[PDB]
Amino acid sequence: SQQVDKIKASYPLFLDQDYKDMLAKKRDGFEEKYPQDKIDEVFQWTTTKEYQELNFQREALTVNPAKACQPLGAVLCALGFEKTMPYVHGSQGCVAYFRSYFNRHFREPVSCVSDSMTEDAAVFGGQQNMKDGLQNCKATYKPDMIAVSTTCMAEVIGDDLNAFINNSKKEGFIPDEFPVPFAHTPSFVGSHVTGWDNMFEGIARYFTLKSMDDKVVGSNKKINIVPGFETYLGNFRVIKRMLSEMGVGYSLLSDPEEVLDTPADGQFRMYAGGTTQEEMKDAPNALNTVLLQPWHLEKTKKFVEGTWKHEVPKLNIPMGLDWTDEFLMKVSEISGQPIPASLTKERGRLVDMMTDSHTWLHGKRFALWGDPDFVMGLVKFLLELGCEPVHILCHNGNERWKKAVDAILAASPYGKNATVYIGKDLWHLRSLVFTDKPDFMIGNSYGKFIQRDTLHKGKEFEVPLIRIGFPIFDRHHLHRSTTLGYEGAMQILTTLVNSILERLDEETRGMQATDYNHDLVR
Amino acid sequence: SQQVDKIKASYPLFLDQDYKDMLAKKRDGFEEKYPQDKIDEVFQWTTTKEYQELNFQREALTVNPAKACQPLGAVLCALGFEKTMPYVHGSQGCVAYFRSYFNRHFREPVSCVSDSMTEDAAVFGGQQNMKDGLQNCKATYKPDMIAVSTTCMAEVIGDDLNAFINNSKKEGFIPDEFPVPFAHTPSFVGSHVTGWDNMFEGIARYFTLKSMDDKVVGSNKKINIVPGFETYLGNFRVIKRMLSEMGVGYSLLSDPEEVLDTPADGQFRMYAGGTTQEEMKDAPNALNTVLLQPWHLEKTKKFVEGTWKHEVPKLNIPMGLDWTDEFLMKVSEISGQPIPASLTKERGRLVDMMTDSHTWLHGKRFALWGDPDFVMGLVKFLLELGCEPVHILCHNGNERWKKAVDAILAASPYGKNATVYIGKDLWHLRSLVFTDKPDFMIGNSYGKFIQRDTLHKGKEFEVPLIRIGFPIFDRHHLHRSTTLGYEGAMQILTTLVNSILERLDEETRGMQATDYNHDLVR
Amino acid sequence: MSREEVESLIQEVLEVYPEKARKDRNKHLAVNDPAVTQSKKCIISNKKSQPGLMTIRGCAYAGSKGVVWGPIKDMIHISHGPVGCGQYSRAGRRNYYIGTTGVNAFVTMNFTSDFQEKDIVFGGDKKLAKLIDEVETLFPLNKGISVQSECPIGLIGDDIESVSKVKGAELSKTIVPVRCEGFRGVSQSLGHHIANDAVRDWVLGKRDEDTTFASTPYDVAIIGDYNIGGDAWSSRILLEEMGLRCVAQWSGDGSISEIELTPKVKLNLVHCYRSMNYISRHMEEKYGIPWMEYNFFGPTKTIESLRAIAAKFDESIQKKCEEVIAKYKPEWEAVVAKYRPRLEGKRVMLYIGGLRPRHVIGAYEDLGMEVVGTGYEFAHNDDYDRTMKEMGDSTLLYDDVTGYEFEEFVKRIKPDLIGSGIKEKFIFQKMGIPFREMHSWDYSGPYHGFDGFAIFARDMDMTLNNPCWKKLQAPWE
Amino acid sequence: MSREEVESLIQEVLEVYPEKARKDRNKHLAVNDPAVTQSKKCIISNKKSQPGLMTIRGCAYAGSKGVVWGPIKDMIHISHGPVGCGQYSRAGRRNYYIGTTGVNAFVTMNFTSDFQEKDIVFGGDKKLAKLIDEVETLFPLNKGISVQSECPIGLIGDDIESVSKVKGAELSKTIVPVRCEGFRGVSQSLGHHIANDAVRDWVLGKRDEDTTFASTPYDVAIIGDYNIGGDAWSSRILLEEMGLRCVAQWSGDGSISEIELTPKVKLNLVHCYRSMNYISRHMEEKYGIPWMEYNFFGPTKTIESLRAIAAKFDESIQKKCEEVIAKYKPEWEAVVAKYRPRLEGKRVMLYIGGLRPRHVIGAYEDLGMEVVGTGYEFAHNDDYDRTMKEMGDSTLLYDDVTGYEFEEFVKRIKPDLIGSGIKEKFIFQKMGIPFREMHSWDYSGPYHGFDGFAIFARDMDMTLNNPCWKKLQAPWE
Numbered sequence A, B: 001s002q003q004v005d006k007i008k009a010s011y012p013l014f015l016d017q018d019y020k021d022m023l024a025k026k027r028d029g030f031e032e033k034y035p036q037d038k039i040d041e042v043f044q045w046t047t048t049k050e051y052q053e054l055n056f057q058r059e060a061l062t063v064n065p066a067k068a069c070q071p072l073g074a075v076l077c078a079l080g081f082e083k084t085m086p087y088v089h090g091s092q093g094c095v096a097y098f099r100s101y102f103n104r105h106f107r108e109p110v111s112c113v114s115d116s117m118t119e120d121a122a123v124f125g126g127q128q129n130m131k132d133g134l135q136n137c138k139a140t141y142k143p144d145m146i147a148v149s150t151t152c153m154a155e156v157i158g159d160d161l162n163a164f165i166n167n168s169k170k171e172g173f174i175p176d177e178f179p180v181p182f183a184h185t186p187s188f189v190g191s192h193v194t195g196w197d198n199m200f201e202g203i204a205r206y207f208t209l210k211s212m213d214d215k216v217v218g219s220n221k222k223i224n225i226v227p228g229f230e231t232y233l234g235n236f237r238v239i240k241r242m243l244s245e246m247g248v249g250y251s252l253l254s255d256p257e258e259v260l261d262t263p264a265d266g267q268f269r270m271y272a273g274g275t276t277q278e279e280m281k282d283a284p285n286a287l288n289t290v291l292l293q294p295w296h297l298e299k300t301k302k303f304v305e306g307t308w309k310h311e312v313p314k315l316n317i318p319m320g321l322d323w324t325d326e327f328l329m330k331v332s333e334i335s336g337q338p339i340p341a342s343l344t345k346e347r348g349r350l351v352d353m354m355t356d357s358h359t360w361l362h363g364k365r366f367a368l369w370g371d372p373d374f375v376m377g378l379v380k381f382l383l384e385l386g387c388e389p390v391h392i393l394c395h396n397g398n399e400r401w402k403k404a405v406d407a408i409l410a411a412s413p414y415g416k417n418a419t420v421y422i423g424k425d426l427w428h429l430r431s432l433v434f435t436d437k438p439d440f441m442i443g444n445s446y447g448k449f450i451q452r453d454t455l456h457k458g459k460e461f462e463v464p465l466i467r468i469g470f471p472i473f474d475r476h477h478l479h480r481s482t483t484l485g486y487e488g489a490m491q492i493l494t495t496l497v498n499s500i501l502e503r504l505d506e507e508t509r510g511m512q513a514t515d516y517n518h519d520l521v522r
Numbered sequence C, D: 001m002s003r004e005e006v007e008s009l010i011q012e013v014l015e016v017y018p019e020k021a022r023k024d025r026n027k028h029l030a031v032n033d034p035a036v037t038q039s040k041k042c043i044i045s046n047k048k049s050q051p052g053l054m055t056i057r058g059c060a061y062a063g064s065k066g067v068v069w070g071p072i073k074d075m076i077h078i079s080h081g082p083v084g085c086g087q088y089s090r091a092g093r094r095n096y097y098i099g100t101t102g103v104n105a106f107v108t109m110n111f112t113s114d115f116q117e118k119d120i121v122f123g124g125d126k127k128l129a130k131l132i133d134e135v136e137t138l139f140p141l142n143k144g145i146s147v148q149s150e151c152p153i154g155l156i157g158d159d160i161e162s163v164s165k166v167k168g169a170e171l172s173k174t175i176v177p178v179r180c181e182g183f184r185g186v187s188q189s190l191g192h193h194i195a196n197d198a199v200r201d202w203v204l205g206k207r208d209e210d211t212t213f214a215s216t217p218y219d220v221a222i223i224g225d226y227n228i229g230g231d232a233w234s235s236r237i238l239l240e241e242m243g244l245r246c247v248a249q250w251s252g253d254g255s256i257s258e259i260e261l262t263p264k265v266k267l268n269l270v271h272c273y274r275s276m277n278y279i280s281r282h283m284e285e286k287y288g289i290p291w292m293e294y295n296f297f298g299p300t301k302t303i304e305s306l307r308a309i310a311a312k313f314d315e316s317i318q319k320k321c322e323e324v325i326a327k328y329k330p331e332w333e334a335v336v337a338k339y340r341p342r343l344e345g346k347r348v349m350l351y352i353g354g355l356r357p358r359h360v361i362g363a364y365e366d367l368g369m370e371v372v373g374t375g376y377e378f379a380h381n382d383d384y385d386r387t388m389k390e391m392g393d394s395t396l397l398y399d400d401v402t403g404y405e406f407e408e409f410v411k412r413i414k415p416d417l418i419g420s421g422i423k424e425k426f427i428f429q430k431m432g433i434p435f436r437e438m439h440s441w442d443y444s445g446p447y448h449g450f451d452g453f454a455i456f457a458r459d460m461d462m463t464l465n466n467p468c469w470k471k472l473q474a475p476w477e
């Protein structure tokens, strides 16, 4: 039933007695459900050190991964170019998923096409799909560039992207001069960030490989910035903002900031802003190239060093105090621009916030996950805050990266009780927050299910989730945030200390039981 | 007892069984406590409509006010001027309290002096305290200006501020030219915002009253901005940023943004930034003067209109969409500067966020409180979001203000079930959120005790607090936020919708009970 | 718009295409003639999508794993292949269930074999067998396993059927191999069909020789309701208030045992025709169980359906039928009274999957609204056959609409409301057009049944009449 | 820093003042001689503040309402006058309690008469009576009312004593008039004395002829512990483990009945000498109850204190005393073992109210730290008498220190740590000096007793040795 003046959605509708009784009868009559005592016993068991050992002995099964597949990253990379259509050569199912995934994180349109390879193309290859697809796409959506990647079907059958595009131009499906950079992006190698790396390297090569002879390093007096796979608008913005306040000439290569944040003013804009073809063509003339997320930009680096002859500085991601400092000093060295009074003051304001909030941050234990550069920057900043990053999980991390993170941990007393996990997933992490319980998790929306699990053992075992990373689907507009620079660190610090205080308020809200410690002032 | 490896602070130390037993013995042995069933009975009674009726009949008792006293506002105003020391003529206890209050909200030093009137000054008046106080202050802390207000002792005994300062200069305690603006600021009239108005009008008068004859309206091509009592750094900053983006010349009169946010870089800065004496002296030459919070700047307005001859525009506080639009359009009209593309875009982005989040916001019911301009602005924005501001409490509001808000409410269907309360306190509001339960409260930290109370009735009656306003003592760095302009509306929107989704996640976190609605995607 | 105006619109929009795409797409766009019973005369469907035109379609894995198998709550479904498909589809569909997730229920979890290159080059059958052992160790209360093939499985020649038979015998466990590789078929639809056949071949006959089930004359199954936001629960309640016994739900909140008990029922009640007509037909051919189509969207369709279902039984169910209708009459009448005047006359365009673009028209009309355009991602012509009678004269129909087409159609027709999917939502909101997700229900619902109708109405109203839509144009231009 | 150097520092700092202030402040600054008995040899205290010099002091209202009466949990305390005082002091002090707030306990609430101009012009006594009626109506479980006078009350000639008597008899309720107007005295201190006298005159003797309380030889009261962060509870536990019965706590977590029962105890245990020596002396004079000073900061002082208290009772308590000391020995030894190596040798400056600037010194020394400067806002010379023996030679002493003085002293002495109040904290953090609040314990605590010592050590370490302090200078300078 419904009361028309206060209508119930699923929650709390199905808590009505007639629905509860109905559901009990469904269960009892037809579900042949394990007895509740057995369900309890098995749950309890899944929280133990014994289960955790069995769990970490897995070799074949993956449960609740914390990574996605390459072409997702290729698409995000491509969106960052002016009037550019991401194009995934392969099966269309993939593109519905790519688009929906990003739709839900950014709450924005995400344009991407497929060339719809089907069973016919599975033995003959997708050459005809490429011809018709490029022609149809260019005619219908009017991009000025089509950036081509692949699904795992096209990869397995061995479609030669280069040959297919070359033949597409040769037979008149698209103009010879129309830009079609490409990259092979297999599902089964690396992760989404690898796809970003591959696509970017493909685009850079497309615009610079054949014209290196009139290039002179430093001749345009700018610094190139390659952001990598980035899903916080605030991070593109903050990097551009700091460089501008320093008076540094720059070119941000792959810049989806505008197209991921168009106004609702009565028209839909399929394309907006983005790195220009001009910028890519001119990029070798920069003083140098700075990689914001070097641990998934290795191929790009190989090309920039080898072909553009830029001496890519050895910088960590500009996250936290020390690494933002280092990024700024390196930028100053390269450009010859001094660090301005404004950034010095911003830095000091961050330090001030640290002094203000250190007593609540001290010794707090975190489980956390995400992509490698993001993860190591989060770790570094936590150590700077006097926090303990006890469970550090990076599903798509590698052994070299793990060595780097272990060295970071060793350089601080706050790293004593920390372990770095690569190749492990959120079912592994679930076990860790049961057996060696932290105070909080820092992670994406999939963490909510771990929080649920822990509360199920008991309120005292609950590990609340702090949402930082990608994807965040169950809160609105967090994609507008910043995690880079002093600004990013200020936001992260604030989020952390106030999550701590929220939880403490919850634990002390009990009238005449715990509210002796429900302080007005903290 | 303690375990050295996991030391317990008060929470949860006093939950140990030996402490529990001790407290039980103290209670039973010596406290002659009402029996728990009587305490339960009375609590239950205090949640009833009968109790509320008794509650709203109070004429003499005030319980948990939502206002402070005038000189608090004077000190904040004064802090907004370059190298200026706030000086409160009267008893020193007041100044210890003003400073601590703001210390705790901004987490920053707050400098202010007293001239420490005691029992002697109670009978002879405080003339000597003013002489010695002004001389000592000037010598010791080296301000370029001393801004003088009063505590209620000085008001009651009738100290003539003007005469006392004049005599201090006449007898050589401070130089004749040393600027000492003043304002009478009685505890027992109005509230802290009134103290702001009085202090500001006093400084304006000090610097312009006697120099009007060479003044020409519009001759400096600036617009004066008077912010009023403002405790969010982001609000000073966002007004300055929007005006700069428009290329509009301006003077922000009373600007404490720098002095309330100095960097931690190894030195303490007693003074930083602020409105210059020259800016105040030159202020009558502006095109016009805009009052950001007109409902507590009436004295200032009468002076600006009557003496500077500026035609102060009839603008609401620039909060929410319509009133930020109106503000920008009026600034455009006065300045002759068009609204730039960047601000039009920012507006459209606010509107995108409203379309993105409207289904979770729609029909949500709020109780809220604060100062009059803040409150009416919050109400307006909530109406724009399709929310119902059902209980609107403004302790220091008046009937003219209430009439204006009632008109705003009538102009929207979302205002049908809304009532405005003036002269009422947070104990009144407590009753309202029991008898006519809203979904959330929007208020300052004192609201936490109402949330506590509601949870005590039951989880299903709990009304979560959303912290916006002043003071905020129990979270860190929220004073860095913005509530004005499109930026402030984006921040408020995000806070509201995510408070909504946080509470829904809590209510659906129950394994096999409510977690059928524990959606990954919202 | 007149018929002629719609035809002109169609040709105009078709003008941008290369000639091959234009001639294909012309066959997939039509102007409704409500007199037409046979749709093949006016529109073509279930064909390959044109390359590069941004179809809104998904794949067969989406149809099998995402749609049909995924909701079965006490089985574990393995996304078999590389890591992408299972991650993007993890908890994207709100197919609601009661259970203890990770212990006896597994729906919102993502199990995957996470193929690396070595699995591609050497095959994944050994990894799959090892995976199944790890699944048994770490999830002992699971009641069966499915293997949802992703694109590479068939392309590299793995033999998951052999693995399923052998590990199934070893562990005495139902392990179901499903060949729903994304390259098969042209859309989600073939995934439905493959999935239906997998249920048929590996699950449905297990209790063929078991006679322990206590049957009654009033046993039914709900076939093709995936319980989006509780849709199936708000349907079930009505069927049982009417005196029927719902032995099974396929597959929202579904258990493997109710699947296995479904051949014991007296009648199959089919909501989603598209996705489960295959197994409904099989159950008629093999067990002699009749099936009938019904519609629980809005009071007109729900009342009609309850009466039609009740007529298949005796006087006692018909009596109960009228009692249910009388019980709910004041409730849905109250909803109509509150919301129809606020929605009267408003025009809606829909674009959804294979059932809802026709099935919800009645609910809209119950609120006095008009559906002026509709279309499906992957319906077949028997669907359009069922659609043209439900739509008004001169209305616009589109099969596998392209992004470009949909945007241009909306621009010309100017609906007051659009109902479609997550990939469409933010596009049309930016145009100043109210949007409701008619797959996920925009995280609201249920919409089925009387209780669902109230929520549907509330939702259409809250969004169409929201203050935000008056604010997209800056007052200074 | 040698004696002559500290004296020179003092003369240097004083050079900025006008002559009157210089001559006054010179008397309030001293170089410690631990041998000195009469601090009046070397320093003056409890005098007026110099106008305009930014004293850190509060007022008599702070000393009466904020400090003494405020914590009494089952009474309702009226901040009588305009709205400011009650609001700034609402829940600023962490005087912890057990109760049901708004129902039977009221500590963190702000009750006020909210004086408007008419109340100033006509007087507030009629308002006060009506207010008391409303308090009775809306808070029927209150066990008494106090009236905390703010500045205007005495200035306008109100008679709150008559109102307290008349309404008190009418309601048969204890209603206590307190003349703690902020213009009285020179600081919080006189507010203490005033509050003590009010307890004496209106509460303490109510049970003088009541002989129903069952007494024992081991009854004590804790006098002058306001239970900051639970300080009195972690003290009480030790006293009762030793075999004593703590009849009353003044006033942290204190009830009016405990107060009324205090004349039945055998011994008064005085922690805060400054704020409650008055009533202790009164109780000796009127009831013959002896009182003694003790110190529960750190294990050395807590142990010394336990032994000294136990020595006032028989051998059975002296034995239990040694048993408590042995019980907790490994715990505080473990604290020392963990934190002393990180704190050994570090130098601290203190500036607090009337007790802690001497009382926590032992606790610092137990962690191997040295107090190199200390001072009080409002202490009297008998506090300084007790101070000079606790401080090292040639350390710096400051009475009613000015903002300027404290800053210059810190710049020259360069302590590793500062312990003071909220108005000081952010000043010295910005200078790169670790700061701990030693009024509020920086929202941590308790610090009293053995359990308190663990938290104390943990806090001093987390702050003094925090990584943030290494980062205040930009690497580019």
Ligand code: ICS
Residues within 6 Å of the ligand: D063, D067, D093, D188, D226, D228, D272, D273, D274, D275, D352, D353, D354, D355, D356, D357, D438, D439, D440
């Ligand atoms: S009462 Fe006094 S200022 Fe003895 S007014 Fe003050 S809770 Fe201080 S040094 Mo705040 S004489 Fe208590 C004090 Fe000491 S409020 Fe607390 S810390 S031991």
Ligand code: CLF
Residues within 6 Å of the ligand: A069, A070, A071, A091, A092, A093, A094, A095, A097, A150, A151, A152, A153, A187, C059, C060, C061, C062, C081, C082, C083, C084, C085, C086, C149, C150, C151, C180, C181, C182, C183
């Ligand atoms: S059409 Fe469908 S969703 Fe596409 S792959 Fe094929 S079954 Fe799957 Fe999978 S891993 Fe990523 S998302 Fe693709 S490229 Fe391969």
Ligand code: CLF
Residues within 6 Å of the ligand: B069, B070, B071, B091, B092, B093, B094, B095, B097, B150, B151, B152, B153, B187, D059, D060, D061, D062, D081, D082, D083, D084, D085, D086, D149, D150, D151, D180, D181, D182, D183
């Ligand atoms: S010294 Fe002390 S705190 Fe000061 S007033 Fe006097 S009792 Fe009170 Fe009160 S209301 Fe405001 S804060 Fe003052 S000016 Fe009057």
Ligand SMILES: [Ca+2]
Residues within 6 Å of the ligand: A106, A107, A108, B352, B353, B356, C426
């Ligand atoms: Ca959006």
Ligand SMILES: [Ca+2]
Residues within 6 Å of the ligand: A352, A353, A356, B106, B107, B108, D426
């Ligand atoms: Ca600060």
